[PDB]
Design a protein around this nucleic acid. Structure first.
Ligand SMILES: [Mg+2]
Ligand code: NA
Length: 350
DNA sequence: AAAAAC
DNA sequence: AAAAAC
DNA sequence: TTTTTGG
């Protein structure tokens, strides 16, 4: 029997139903842009269960017993089996509101609100936006346009590994005992990604040392002419669990990666890097949260509430019946507390 | 406000 | 048919 | 959009 929760499935990078999940991913993106939460969530769950399957869907009998697939999803599956394409998703791909949303949000610093504001102002290309004498861009959007070609072209495992070394070298200069862990998609065994995420924690660090680290590291890169963009968000952490973002201290950077650190034109590459500074006692929760994937986390939180009367987030796990916070030194302990079998990072690609 | 994250 | 999906 | 409706 296949579970409706991504956290009770193994989802590797081997997808047998990519023609189906591409269509569902487009329809989900279309409902996410039109804000429609309900439909959007059902398509992501459908697309997610299909990625977990150890076989391709060739007939409608192949959908029997698979959760998450209702009358609409089955109609899209039946459409792809017949013509080999989705008329529903092809419609969305030719739709100007989607093309424009996909294009505008692809800029670093432009989200759903700016993309819609621009689409309603009659804009359809990034060229017309930059040429427009009236528009005023945020320091973030100015960075996003200035390094667009570098950011829109995915980062790879040699580059991510070159960034990891660079991050580690900067951190251990200020905190020798610091543990730096590459999270996100790369930790899930991905070959490519848009950014490289990191989790920094230090057992021997003082409270002042934890707060001043991201400033010490970013100014160090600024002095070396490597910092292209920087935004440090201060910690709001305590801790009341609620039914988003993390309260950990973090920063969103664009780093200059010299080609000589990887194995040309510029001699460097603009790379989007996220650094998350977390207290040592909360490290497993932060590592479980920043590893992802989005759907895996959503289902970990969903399973915890609905099947266990527990509240999980990036900071802690709370048992609602025992009225106590559950302590964990590893991701394996969080899974244990939840009553789940451990899922390896490269099996969380839901 | 809006954006940045899995 | 109506509602909640954390 | 899917699921649940006294499961
Ligand atoms: Mg990432
Ligand atoms: Na964006």
């Amino acid at each position: 029997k296949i579970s409706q929760y991504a956290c009770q499935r193994r989802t590797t990078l081997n997808n047998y139903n990519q023609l189906f999940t591409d269509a569902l991913d487009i329809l989900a993106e279309n409902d996410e842009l039109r804000e429609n939460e309900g439909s959007c969530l059902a398509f992501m769950r459908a697309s997610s269960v299909l990625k977990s399957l150890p076989f391709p869907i060739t007939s409608m009998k192949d959908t029997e017993g698979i959760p998450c697939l209702g009358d609409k999803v089955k109609s899209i599956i039946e459409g792809i089996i017949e013509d080999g394409e989705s008329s529903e998703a092809k419609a969305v791909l030719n739709d100007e509101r989607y093309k424009s949303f996909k294009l505008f949000t692809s800029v670093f610093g432009v989200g759903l609100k700016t993309a819609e504001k621009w689409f309603r102002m009659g804009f359809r290309t990034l060229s017309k936006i930059q040429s427009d004498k009236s528009l005023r861009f945020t320091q973030m959007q100015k960075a996003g346009f200035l390094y667009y070609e570098d950011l829109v072209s995915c980062v790879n495992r040699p580059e991510a590994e070159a960034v990891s070394m660079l991050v580690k070298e900067a951190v251990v200069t200020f905190l020798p005992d610091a543990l730096v862990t590459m999270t996100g998609g790369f930790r899930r065994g991905k070959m490519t990604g848009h950014d490289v995420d990191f989790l920094i924690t230090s057992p021997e660090a003082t409270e002042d040392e934890e707060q001043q680290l991201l400033h010490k590291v970013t100014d160090f890169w600024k002095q070396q002419g490597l910092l292209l963009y920087c935004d440090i968000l201060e910690s709001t952490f305590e801790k009341q669990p609620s039914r988003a973002l993390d309260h950990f201290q973090k920063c969103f950077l664009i780093l200059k990666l010299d080609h000589g650190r990887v194995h040309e034109g510029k001699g460097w590459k603009a790379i989007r890097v996220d650094l998350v500074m977390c207290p040592y006692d909360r490290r497993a929760f932060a590592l479980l949260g920043w590893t992802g994937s989005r759907q895996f986390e959503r289902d970990l939180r969903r399973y915890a509430t609905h099947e266990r009367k527990m509240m999980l987030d990036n900071h802690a796990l709370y048992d609602r019946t025992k009225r106590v916070f559950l302590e964990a030194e590893s991701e394996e302990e969080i899974f244990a507390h939840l009553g789940l079998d451990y899922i390896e990072p490269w099996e969380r690609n839901a």
